[PDB]
Amino acid sequence: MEKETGPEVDDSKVTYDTIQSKVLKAVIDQAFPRVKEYSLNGHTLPGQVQQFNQVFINNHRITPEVTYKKINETTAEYLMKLRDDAHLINAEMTVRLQVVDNQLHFDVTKIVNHNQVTPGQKIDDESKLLSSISFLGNALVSVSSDQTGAKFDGATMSNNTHVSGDDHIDVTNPMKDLAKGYMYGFVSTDKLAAGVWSNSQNSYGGGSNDWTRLTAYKETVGNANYVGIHSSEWQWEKAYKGIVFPEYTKELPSAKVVITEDANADKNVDWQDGAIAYRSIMNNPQGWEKVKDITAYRIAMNFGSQAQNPFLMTLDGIKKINLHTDGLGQGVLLKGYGSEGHDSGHLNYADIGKRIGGVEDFKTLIEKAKKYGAHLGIHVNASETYPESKYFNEKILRKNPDGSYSYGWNWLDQGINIDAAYDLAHGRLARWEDLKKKLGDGLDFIYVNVWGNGQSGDNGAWATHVLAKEINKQGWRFAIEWGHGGEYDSTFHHWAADLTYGGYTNKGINSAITRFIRNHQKDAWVGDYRSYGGAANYPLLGGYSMKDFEGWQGRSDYNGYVTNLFAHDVMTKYFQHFTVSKWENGTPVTMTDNGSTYKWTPEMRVELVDADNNKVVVTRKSNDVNSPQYRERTVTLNGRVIQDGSAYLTPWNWDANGKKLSTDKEKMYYFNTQAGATTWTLPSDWAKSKVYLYKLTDQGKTEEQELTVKDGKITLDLLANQPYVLYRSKQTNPEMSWSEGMHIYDQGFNSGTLKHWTISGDASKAEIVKSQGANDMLRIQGNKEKVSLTQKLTGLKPNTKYAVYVGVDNRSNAKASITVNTGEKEVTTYTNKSLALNYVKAYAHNTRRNNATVDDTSYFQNMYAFFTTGADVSNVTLTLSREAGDEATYFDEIRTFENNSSMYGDKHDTGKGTFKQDFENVAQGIFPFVVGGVEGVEDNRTHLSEKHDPYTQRGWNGKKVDDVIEGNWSLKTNGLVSRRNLVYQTIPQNFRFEAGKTYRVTFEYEAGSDNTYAFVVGKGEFQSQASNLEMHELPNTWTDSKKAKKATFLVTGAETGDTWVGIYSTGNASNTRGDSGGNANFRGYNDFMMDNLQIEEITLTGKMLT
Ligand SMILES: CC(=O)N[C@H]1[C@@H](OC[C@H](N)C(=O)O)O[C@H](CO)[C@H](O)[C@@H]1O[C@@H]1O[C@H](CO)[C@H](O)[C@H](O)[C@H]1O
Ligand SMILES: [Ca+2]
Ligand SMILES: [Ca+2]
Ligand SMILES: [Ca+2]
Ligand SMILES: [Mn+2]
């Protein structure tokens, strides 16, 4: 390339003015809100040196008619009239330029559209809206190739660990052309650096073209090249299908420049100085301050009516983590907080799940969690819905150009995507307000799943900012699924924080510039995941690594959850208590992974600081990518080593909510991923103190040991992958009030003792033991006489109907029982040997080997008693018992909760009399059935279907069968045809067919096809050597009937007491009658629904005999 030239500047017809603070002067044009040049401490940066007196309004070029007024020494104002008759533009906007110390503020302070526009109302011609305002072509700041050290540095969105989103461009003549959007952008000389912020929600496209609030341009002026940073275009009045959006969707355009000398004392002026200064002018995502102290994120899952994780139970999980981390902060995402659980009832945000304890228990969870620094969030969806949801309506549904439904997710039911723009234009905001009204204060975050993938149409920067603003207005923090989503407002990105998702192209934001700026404000980054290479091969700042133990994707590994907190998250969060001040890259390395060999330039040293002038230095131990030292760092705090390679001894001076700890509560955490002794220098305020070490377990601080301090040092030679904590004085563990609000003490056997139970019989026969997943359970075995354990049920309401269950896995033939005595009445339920394996994937005691009870299996199933309190609730007792037997019974999870079922002779209490299940008052699950093994351990595709006429019922969109047969609820199975396996079955603890007695079993059913499902009678444990079943294939219920059919069967209990009945998915092909895809799923060809179950003990007489 040859040296470039462009027109010189003739300013003979220009009148300039100046506005200035004490430190910064800006020369501004009186004709147009343009800054020619900035001066600070005798140094200069150009602005827009060549006049460009045009703006673009709705993408039309306009020469504004401008009048000017200098308001005061720092502030000028411009009235800009905008007229273009041919394009129906008739408007005016007012702009102010204001110097605030070393900042320049550009604000559109008033906009008037002379066309008639009413937010929320019809507009007959959308071209009458004032929809976009662009000042592209007027740089807010620039640098010239004639200036020493002229450079531009900008960040774009990249989620590929191999590809940095950052550009670093020397501003030279000649240079390559530049006309490109950026999220962040800095220009600098060797004397001054500038950064630019804008609230513009412009996009130039997806990927690296998105979130492009700035635009950088090269312009050649005389003999110099300038690179200028412009705000990208701003949005204003918008509509969807002629309906103007609500007023709150309009945000007045704003941009700021900040200009700085050296800001990190390294005696160089570059983009890093700009980035430090940029923190004073940037938007900050709402709730960001909380992020640095949320050390323990995880998901607690409910799904398919099962109530795997009742709100009050999650509080016990929080207490376990509080003990095990010694008071680190927590963030629990409640996936399935609403309706029947995860992916039920979407859009009705206020519908808090009733079977997990409803709004009352959710409020209690939020309140009691505060003292543990545990913040709750919920999973919501703003992109698709199901017929059951109150908000399912034809008008909200997304249609394709050909008129067909845009079908969404199919799992429990077939959903349909919604049109998010229609939704915004028709009262979406009110749904968040309804949830806020019902739930009240204290919820931390809303996690909006799926948004950003286009299912509901436009989910880009503007639409996401609007959505985030609705959520933030209720006082909630915004969180999102995708690494690329919600760049402006999000504080958490699930695909950044769960390192296992999506592979190397779909992770967090791969930008040193962006991470420098915002590391402390969000978990949005690239964490350590060696097999992705590039930025993920041991990032020096770490990066959030999320695991779970409460059922999400079948995750149950508590111990691995805790070790991962300490292996990745403690130091990640430590760094978030400081701001990045310096970032030094090393030499490029060559890596090979994921099918390519590529160059990567790694960070080698990162420095951070806080408001107390503490200094943290993180250094990679080697730039050699093939050395073990590439994946090691040292960390110093004011020069003192706190991490070196596999071990750290890190101070922690913040309580679980982030508040500064008192001196006597200051501590240090030790963790080493390897065996071996390590030696550490103590800080001066520890060097002469006594020091005590504790091993951290689910019981809190254990194995107290005073350490020997020699020459101000300590040496630690402890277990690998085991957290420890150090203090300068002896510490104890607090009372945890286990299971508070649940009417019993320590329902999950987490307190390490049984002393709060009254034990009758030989107490040595009852012990707390760990499952194969380390889940503590009550075990009774080897007893020659009855052993019972009793507690009072406390805090009950008088004259109230209740259910109680205990999870039970009985490996003995001996009777294992749950008994409630109300003071006035006693009810009891028992099981002999358990015969049904547990297939509920989100449930902690399913039969997956790694959370098996014993012998690699789990037969845990909920064993219920139903009772009613009288006038006096001071002596209501719950007893677990086990008659004599050699083998073990395991019990875990005692849940007592209001319930209004009437299953026993039309009465509530466990008792004699005809059994009936109308499904209208189910405590949880699909009682008296339990899900079978048809899908193995799964988020089972059988659940309680909820009525919403007409959408859930025959005829809507050609639906062949009703989701709900009678009342508001039925038992629905979605699409589980041709599986040759058991869909669900009774178990004797839920309904016992007594030996030698005969029962009439009746129910109503829908079936979409002939002989796809069968009513079956079995006994003992089902094996798919296959078990004998009595098989009754069921015809479809709609080709020759306008409603569900009634079925009736006689069943005599086998002498072994283990008879059961159920529904089996046959080997027959279903018939979708020429329909396919979403239509076929929605219409119910492959479905089965049951309702109005009745089981009556009878004596065979007369014609019953035939
Ligand atoms: C990872 C995740 O959140 N997936 C949910 C997402 O799935 C679509 C893509 N595969 C993706 O974004 O990852 O959105 C759908 C709803 O449209 C589901 O919520 C996905 O989660 C899945 O939910 C089902 C139950 O519906 C099961 O629990 C799966 O285990 C779970 O991954
Ligand atoms: Ca510097
Ligand atoms: Ca337990
Ligand atoms: Ca019903
Ligand atoms: Mn449903």
Swiss-Prot record:
Active-site residue list: N449, E481
Application notes: Was identified as a vaccine antigen as it provides significant cross-protection in a stringent mouse model of lethal sepsis.
Keyword Repeat: no
GO cellular component: extracellular region
Note: The hydrolysis reaction catalyzed by SpGH101 proceeds with retention of the anomeric configuration.
Source species: Streptococcus pneumoniae serotype 4 (strain ATCC BAA-334 / TIGR4)
Protein name (Swiss-Prot/TrEMBL): Endo-alpha-N-acetylgalactosaminidase
Domain of life assignment: Bacteria
Residues holding Ca(2+) 1: D262, N264, D266, N268, D273
Annotated keywords: Calcium, Cell wall, Glycosidase, Hydrolase, Metal-binding, Peptidoglycan-anchor, Secreted, Signal, Virulence
Residues holding Ca(2+) 2: D918, E920, E966, W969, D1091
Major site of localization recorded for this protein: secreted
Reactions catalysed, as given in the entry: a 3-O-[beta-D-galactosyl-(1->3)-N-acetyl-alpha-D-galactosaminyl]-L-threonyl-[protein] + H2O = beta-D-galactosyl-(1->3)-N-acetyl-D-galactosamine + L-threonyl-[protein]; a 3-O-[beta-D-galactosyl-(1->3)-N-acetyl-alpha-D-galactosaminyl]-L-seryl-[protein] + H2O = beta-D-galactosyl-(1->3)-N-acetyl-D-galactosamine + L-seryl-[protein]
